Amino acid sequence: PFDYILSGGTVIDGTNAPGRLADVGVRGDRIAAVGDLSASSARRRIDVAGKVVSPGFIDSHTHDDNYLLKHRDMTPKISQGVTTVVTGNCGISLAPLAHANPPAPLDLLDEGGSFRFARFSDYLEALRAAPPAVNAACMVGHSTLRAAVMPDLRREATADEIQAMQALADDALASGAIGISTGAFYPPAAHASTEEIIEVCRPLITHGGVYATAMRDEGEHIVQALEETFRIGRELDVPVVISHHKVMGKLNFGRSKETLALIEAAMASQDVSLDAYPYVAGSTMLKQDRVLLAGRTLITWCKPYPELSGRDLEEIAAERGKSKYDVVPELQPAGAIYFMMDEPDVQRILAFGPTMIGSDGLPHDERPHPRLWGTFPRVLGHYSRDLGLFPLETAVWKMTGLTAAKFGLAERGQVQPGYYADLVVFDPATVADSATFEHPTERAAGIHSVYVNGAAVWEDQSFTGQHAGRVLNR
Ligand SMILES: [Zn+2]
């Protein structure tokens, strides 16, 4: 007999096909059957009439590396219907690195002495021993590797350092990492040459992992950054994932037509993917950058001056008698939200066929960007239902079937017999992001229940206590 059957609802199976009325039966950690299951014995027959049963959402871009360890409930994500998270993005991974004061933006994962894993396997072992509520597909970050190997990061790596980083990268992949990510836009890796990146990532071809990247530049020189990324992809002959695609700065508004055309062209000749979050503001370390600081900027957290959390940087700068750009150094290390994107571009990028959904949430932030709590329902409700940017089955596909395929997460991302029972039950009519910039931690509406490996992790708007997540391998 099945452990339970979610009956009477509409199944959107994650294959980008219109929903159909069907029941979903689960046995253990697997979807046992799909369709009219009235004739199948089940210990429980849960009524989900009026609801949609879809695969659990896979967050293609997270910085939950440490959050998975410190807050196993993973409420910010499971409350949105997320059942799997891809960690170690933008070249930022928790391991391998034993450092009491890791350089920004690595500190976005730190809660105080959090970087205690000398080896990547130690990190994965820790997750398996005390599993989080969601599954985890982990990547190792190039910037973390540089921090672990290089005495001085403000220069290109030497042959010996590249060899040391490549060794760590290979060990990580051998231990279960699903890929390597880079973030050359940031200080720790701004001096890394394209050749350094290629050599450090050589193990990807042997282990069959992916190359993910926060491109070196997403503004005036985004074309050159895109070309570098495509080049690395060809040199490695592995799939590449362009993280949080956008065109930033008023002088680049509307250029998404241009970038998407370049990406579409590259996809015809090589393996290219991309993801994005549904907002016009970004968030990361507070950095001295003319473009990032051109528009409205909010502080998410500040080490030297904790009271600044939540404040407008323009006000802070003005009151200190300096420009936003000049006041940044004295406020570091800190985090911020940057309003430097335009809605039309965000919509164009989200609607672009291949674009996967990634929250890019920064879970440790005192006053976080709302994407941390409302990304997925915002795509399902606001964009799909309310604006009609795409049909619901396509919106679901963009956060389930597509993502599972691109990251190689076998037997997940689809409501199919035999696949793992990562599922979400939501009300298509009411699903919506409740988090706003003003109140960034409000729980989304319309999320009835969430299941991971068959176990309900979210029910009655609360974590059930089921630490059902597993460390996944590609
Ligand atoms: Zn990121």
Side-chain angles (χ1 to χ4, degrees), residues 1-473:
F2 302 159
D3 292 320
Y4 60 94
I5 292 175
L6 299 178
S7 60
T10 298
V11 171
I12 292 185
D13 66 13
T15 70
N16 204 1
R20 64 179 188 289
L21 292 175
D23 308 323
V24 180
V26 173
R27 183 189 287 108
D29 60 2
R30 307 279 182 167
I31 296 174
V34 184
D36 177 350
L37 307 181
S38 56
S40 293
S41 171
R43 296 181 184 294
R44 297 166 61 196
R45 209 172 292 271
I46 308 171
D47 168 52
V48 296
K51 309 293 196 304
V52 162
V53 179
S54 72
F57 310 144
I58 303 173
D59 197 338
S60 70
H61 191 98
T62 82
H63 290 296
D64 296 331
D65 301 49
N66 192 38
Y67 207 76
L68 292 164
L69 297 171
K70 306 296 183 179
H71 304 283
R72 300 168 65 194
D73 55 280
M74 290 294 291
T75 301
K77 302 306 178 73
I78 62 177
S79 65
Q80 301 184 233
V82 172
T83 55
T84 295
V85 299
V86 174
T87 70
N89 291 98
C90 300
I92 308 170
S93 63
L94 185 60
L97 176 67
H99 199 311
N101 302 294
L106 281 58
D107 56 358
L108 290 174
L109 306 178
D110 207 353
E111 249 179 39
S114 294
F115 289 72
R116 67 184 187 74
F117 301 102
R119 297 169 303 198
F120 201 81
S121 57
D122 297 319
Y123 169 69
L124 295 183
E125 286 163 21
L127 290 174
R128 303 195 186 90
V134 301
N135 299 303
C138 315
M139 291 194 286
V140 56
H142 171 242
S143 290
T144 294
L145 294 180
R146 286 188 126 237
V149 173
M150 306 176 70
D152 172 44
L153 299 172
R154 301 181 59 181
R155 60 179 176 66
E156 205 192 322
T158 63
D160 292 310
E161 303 177 319
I162 289 179
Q163 281 163 31
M165 291 189 279
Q166 182 267 12
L168 290 176
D170 183 76
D171 291 317
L173 290 171
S175 299
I178 65 164
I180 302 171
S181 73
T182 61
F185 174 63
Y186 302 103
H191 289 272
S193 65
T194 304
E195 284 306 312
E196 176 190 315
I197 290 174
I198 292 172
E199 294 307 322
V200 173
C201 299
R202 295 291 191 186
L204 290 176
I205 191 65
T206 306
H207 294 282
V210 300
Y211 171 78
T213 177
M215 300 194 292
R216 198 179 291 273
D217 187 276
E218 300 185 300
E220 170 175 41
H221 302 295
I222 191 170
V223 170
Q224 294 63 55
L226 281 162
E227 291 306 315
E228 168 179 42
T229 298
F230 299 145
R231 176 59 180 290
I232 292 173
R234 293 193 294 280
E235 298 299 295
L236 298 169
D237 187 43
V238 300
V240 300
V241 177
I242 293 167
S243 304
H244 51 58
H245 187 49
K246 69 173 74 63
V247 289
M248 77 167 295
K250 290 184 178 180
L251 292 176
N252 299 296
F253 286 178
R255 293 187 66 201
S256 58
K257 291 181 292 295
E258 186 187 332
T259 61
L260 292 175
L262 287 172
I263 292 171
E264 188 179 303
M267 298 179 148
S269 289
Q270 67 189 90
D271 201 321
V272 180
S273 297
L274 79 168
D275 62 43
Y277 50 80
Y279 303 81
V280 297
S283 188
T284 181
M285 63 175 283
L286 177 64
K287 193 168 89 75
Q288 263 202 318
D289 183 294
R290 303 281 185 192
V291 187
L292 274 183
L293 301 170
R296 186 191 179 194
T297 303
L298 304 177
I299 299 299
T300 54
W301 59 274
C302 181
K303 190 177 183 179
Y305 306 106
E307 69 275 15
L308 300 183
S309 182
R311 293 198 65 185
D312 179 296
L313 184 63
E314 175 64 23
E315 224 176 60
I316 296 171
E319 282 158 47
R320 295 209 172 198
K322 299 174 179 176
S323 60
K324 294 203 201 81
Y325 184 95
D326 290 329
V327 77
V328 165
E330 60 192 273
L331 305 184
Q332 292 176 139
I337 289 171
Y338 307 99
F339 287 77
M340 37 59 179
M341 285 171 283
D342 203 37
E343 185 67 25
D345 289 307
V346 178
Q347 282 184 27
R348 184 176 295 98
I349 293 170
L350 288 172
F352 180 62
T355 303
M356 305 176 279
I357 308 305
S359 74
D360 203 359
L362 301 177
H364 303 99
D365 288 9
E366 177 79 318
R367 296 302 300 169
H369 180 308
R371 64 196 191 190
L372 170 67
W373 291 80
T375 290
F376 300 89
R378 187 173 174 71
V379 169
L380 300 177
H382 180 65
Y383 285 112
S384 181
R385 181 192 59 233
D386 303 329
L387 295 183
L389 193 59
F390 27 52
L392 189 55
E393 61 268 27
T394 297
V396 168
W397 173 74
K398 281 172 166 288
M399 54 180 75
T400 58
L402 170 61
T403 311
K406 298 310 184 66
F407 285 98
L409 309 182
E411 301 184 298
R412 293 177 194 281
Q414 296 184 40
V415 180
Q416 302 275 15
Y419 275 43
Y420 285 105
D422 292 340
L423 304 160
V424 180
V425 177
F426 67 96
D427 190 322
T430 65
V431 61
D433 56 308
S434 298
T436 62
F437 283 105
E438 171 178 48
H439 299 133
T441 68
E442 303 304 315
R443 280 57 167 167
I447 302 297
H448 180 270
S449 50
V450 183
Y451 303 78
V452 174
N453 293 130
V457 294
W458 187 256
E459 285 189 300
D460 297 309
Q461 288 305 100
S462 174
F463 170 49
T464 63
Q466 295 291 319
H467 297 101
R470 296 173 191 174
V471 170
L472 308 183
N473 297 155

Short mmCIF file of all heavy atoms in Angstrom, two decimals, residues 308-335:
data_model
loop_
_atom_site.label_atom_id
_atom_site.label_comp_id
_atom_site.label_asym_id
_atom_site.label_seq_id
_atom_site.Cartn_x
_atom_site.Cartn_y
_atom_site.Cartn_z
N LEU A 308 23.67 50.42 11.38
CA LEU A 308 23.39 50.84 10.01
C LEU A 308 22.51 49.86 9.22
O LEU A 308 22.00 50.19 8.16
CB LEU A 308 24.69 51.08 9.24
CG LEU A 308 25.62 52.16 9.82
CD1 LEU A 308 26.84 52.32 8.93
CD2 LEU A 308 24.86 53.48 9.95
N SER A 309 22.34 48.66 9.76
CA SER A 309 21.53 47.65 9.09
C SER A 309 20.13 48.18 8.76
O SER A 309 19.41 48.64 9.65
CB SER A 309 21.43 46.40 9.96
OG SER A 309 20.70 45.39 9.31
N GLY A 310 19.76 48.12 7.49
CA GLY A 310 18.45 48.59 7.06
C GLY A 310 18.41 50.02 6.55
O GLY A 310 17.43 50.43 5.93
N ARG A 311 19.47 50.78 6.80
CA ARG A 311 19.52 52.18 6.36
C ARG A 311 19.85 52.40 4.89
O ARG A 311 20.40 51.53 4.21
CB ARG A 311 20.54 52.96 7.19
CG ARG A 311 20.18 53.14 8.66
CD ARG A 311 21.00 54.26 9.26
NE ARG A 311 20.67 55.56 8.66
CZ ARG A 311 21.32 56.69 8.93
NH1 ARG A 311 22.33 56.69 9.79
NH2 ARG A 311 20.95 57.82 8.35
N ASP A 312 19.51 53.59 4.41
CA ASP A 312 19.78 54.00 3.04
C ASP A 312 21.22 54.51 3.01
O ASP A 312 21.59 55.37 3.80
CB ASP A 312 18.81 55.11 2.64
CG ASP A 312 19.03 55.60 1.22
OD1 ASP A 312 20.12 56.15 0.95
OD2 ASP A 312 18.13 55.43 0.38
N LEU A 313 22.03 53.96 2.10
CA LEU A 313 23.43 54.36 2.02
C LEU A 313 23.64 55.82 1.65
O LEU A 313 24.61 56.43 2.09
CB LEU A 313 24.17 53.47 1.02
CG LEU A 313 25.68 53.73 0.91
CD1 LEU A 313 26.37 53.44 2.24
CD2 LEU A 313 26.26 52.85 -0.20
N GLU A 314 22.74 56.38 0.85
CA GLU A 314 22.87 57.78 0.46
C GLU A 314 22.81 58.67 1.70
O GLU A 314 23.59 59.62 1.84
CB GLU A 314 21.75 58.18 -0.51
CG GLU A 314 21.76 59.66 -0.87
CD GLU A 314 23.00 60.06 -1.63
OE1 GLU A 314 23.64 59.18 -2.25
OE2 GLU A 314 23.34 61.27 -1.63
N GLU A 315 21.89 58.36 2.59
CA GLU A 315 21.73 59.12 3.83
C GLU A 315 22.98 58.99 4.69
O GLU A 315 23.49 59.97 5.22
CB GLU A 315 20.51 58.58 4.59
CG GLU A 315 19.61 59.64 5.15
CD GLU A 315 18.38 59.04 5.80
OE1 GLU A 315 18.55 58.26 6.76
OE2 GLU A 315 17.26 59.34 5.34
N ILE A 316 23.47 57.76 4.82
CA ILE A 316 24.67 57.49 5.60
C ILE A 316 25.85 58.28 5.02
O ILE A 316 26.56 58.98 5.74
CB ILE A 316 25.01 55.99 5.59
CG1 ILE A 316 23.89 55.20 6.27
CG2 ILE A 316 26.35 55.74 6.27
CD1 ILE A 316 24.01 53.69 6.13
N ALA A 317 26.04 58.15 3.71
CA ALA A 317 27.13 58.84 3.03
C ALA A 317 27.03 60.35 3.19
O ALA A 317 28.00 61.00 3.59
CB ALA A 317 27.13 58.47 1.54
N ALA A 318 25.87 60.91 2.87
CA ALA A 318 25.66 62.35 2.97
C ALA A 318 25.96 62.87 4.36
O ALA A 318 26.65 63.88 4.52
CB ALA A 318 24.23 62.70 2.57
N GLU A 319 25.46 62.18 5.38
CA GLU A 319 25.67 62.59 6.75
C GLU A 319 27.13 62.45 7.19
O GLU A 319 27.55 63.09 8.16
CB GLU A 319 24.71 61.82 7.67
CG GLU A 319 23.29 62.41 7.60
CD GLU A 319 22.19 61.45 8.04
OE1 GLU A 319 22.34 60.80 9.10
OE2 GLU A 319 21.17 61.36 7.32
N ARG A 320 27.90 61.64 6.48
CA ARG A 320 29.32 61.49 6.79
C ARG A 320 30.12 62.44 5.89
O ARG A 320 31.34 62.49 5.96
CB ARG A 320 29.77 60.04 6.57
CG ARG A 320 29.11 59.07 7.52
CD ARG A 320 29.98 57.87 7.83
NE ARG A 320 29.37 57.06 8.88
CZ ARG A 320 30.03 56.15 9.60
NH1 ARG A 320 31.32 55.95 9.39
NH2 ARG A 320 29.39 55.46 10.54
N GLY A 321 29.40 63.19 5.06
CA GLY A 321 30.04 64.14 4.16
C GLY A 321 30.82 63.52 3.02
O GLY A 321 31.87 64.04 2.63
N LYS A 322 30.30 62.43 2.46
CA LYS A 322 30.98 61.75 1.36
C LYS A 322 30.00 61.12 0.38
O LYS A 322 28.81 60.98 0.67
CB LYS A 322 31.90 60.65 1.91
CG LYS A 322 33.00 61.14 2.83
CD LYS A 322 33.75 59.97 3.44
CE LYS A 322 34.87 60.45 4.35
NZ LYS A 322 35.56 59.32 5.04
N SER A 323 30.50 60.74 -0.79
CA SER A 323 29.68 60.09 -1.79
C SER A 323 29.52 58.64 -1.34
O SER A 323 30.30 58.17 -0.51
CB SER A 323 30.38 60.13 -3.15
OG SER A 323 31.63 59.46 -3.09
N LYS A 324 28.53 57.93 -1.87
CA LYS A 324 28.34 56.53 -1.51
C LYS A 324 29.65 55.79 -1.76
O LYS A 324 30.11 55.01 -0.93
CB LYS A 324 27.25 55.87 -2.36
CG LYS A 324 25.83 56.38 -2.19
CD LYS A 324 24.86 55.29 -2.64
CE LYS A 324 23.48 55.81 -2.99
NZ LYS A 324 23.44 56.39 -4.36
N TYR A 325 30.23 56.04 -2.92
CA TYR A 325 31.48 55.39 -3.31
C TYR A 325 32.60 55.61 -2.30
O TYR A 325 33.27 54.66 -1.89
CB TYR A 325 31.90 55.88 -4.70
CG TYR A 325 33.13 55.20 -5.26
CD1 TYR A 325 33.02 54.10 -6.13
CD2 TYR A 325 34.41 55.66 -4.95
CE1 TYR A 325 34.14 53.48 -6.66
CE2 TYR A 325 35.55 55.04 -5.49
CZ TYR A 325 35.40 53.96 -6.34
OH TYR A 325 36.52 53.35 -6.87
N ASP A 326 32.80 56.86 -1.88
CA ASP A 326 33.87 57.14 -0.93
C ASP A 326 33.64 56.68 0.51
O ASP A 326 34.59 56.44 1.24
CB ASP A 326 34.20 58.64 -0.93
CG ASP A 326 34.89 59.08 -2.21
OD1 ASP A 326 35.63 58.26 -2.80
OD2 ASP A 326 34.72 60.25 -2.62
N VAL A 327 32.38 56.55 0.92
CA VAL A 327 32.09 56.13 2.29
C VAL A 327 32.16 54.61 2.49
O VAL A 327 32.24 54.13 3.62
CB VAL A 327 30.69 56.63 2.75
CG1 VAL A 327 29.59 55.76 2.14
CG2 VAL A 327 30.62 56.63 4.27
N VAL A 328 32.13 53.86 1.40
CA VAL A 328 32.15 52.40 1.50
C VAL A 328 33.28 51.78 2.33
O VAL A 328 33.02 50.96 3.21
CB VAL A 328 32.14 51.73 0.10
CG1 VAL A 328 32.54 50.26 0.20
CG2 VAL A 328 30.74 51.84 -0.51
N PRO A 329 34.54 52.17 2.08
CA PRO A 329 35.66 51.60 2.85
C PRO A 329 35.52 51.60 4.37
O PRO A 329 35.78 50.59 5.03
CB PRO A 329 36.86 52.41 2.37
CG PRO A 329 36.49 52.72 0.94
CD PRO A 329 35.04 53.13 1.08
N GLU A 330 35.09 52.73 4.93
CA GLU A 330 34.95 52.83 6.38
C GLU A 330 33.79 52.01 6.95
O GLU A 330 33.71 51.81 8.16
CB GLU A 330 34.79 54.30 6.79
CG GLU A 330 33.59 54.99 6.18
CD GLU A 330 33.63 56.49 6.38
OE1 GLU A 330 33.15 56.98 7.43
OE2 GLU A 330 34.16 57.18 5.49
N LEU A 331 32.91 51.52 6.08
CA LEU A 331 31.77 50.73 6.52
C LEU A 331 31.98 49.23 6.35
O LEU A 331 31.18 48.43 6.83
CB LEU A 331 30.51 51.14 5.75
CG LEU A 331 30.11 52.62 5.76
CD1 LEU A 331 28.79 52.78 5.02
CD2 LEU A 331 29.98 53.11 7.20
N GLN A 332 33.06 48.84 5.68
CA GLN A 332 33.34 47.43 5.44
C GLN A 332 33.96 46.72 6.65
O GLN A 332 34.67 47.34 7.45
CB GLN A 332 34.24 47.28 4.21
CG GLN A 332 33.54 47.67 2.91
CD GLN A 332 34.45 47.64 1.70
OE1 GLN A 332 34.05 47.19 0.62
NE2 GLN A 332 35.68 48.13 1.85
N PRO A 333 33.68 45.41 6.80
CA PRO A 333 32.83 44.63 5.89
C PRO A 333 31.34 44.83 6.15
O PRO A 333 30.91 45.01 7.30
CB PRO A 333 33.28 43.19 6.16
CG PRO A 333 33.60 43.22 7.62
CD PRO A 333 34.37 44.53 7.76
N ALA A 334 30.56 44.81 5.08
CA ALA A 334 29.12 45.00 5.18
C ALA A 334 28.43 44.40 3.96
O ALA A 334 29.10 43.96 3.02
CB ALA A 334 28.80 46.49 5.28
N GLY A 335 27.11 44.39 3.98
CA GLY A 335 26.35 43.87 2.85
C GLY A 335 25.35 44.93 2.40
O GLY A 335 25.05 45.85 3.16
#
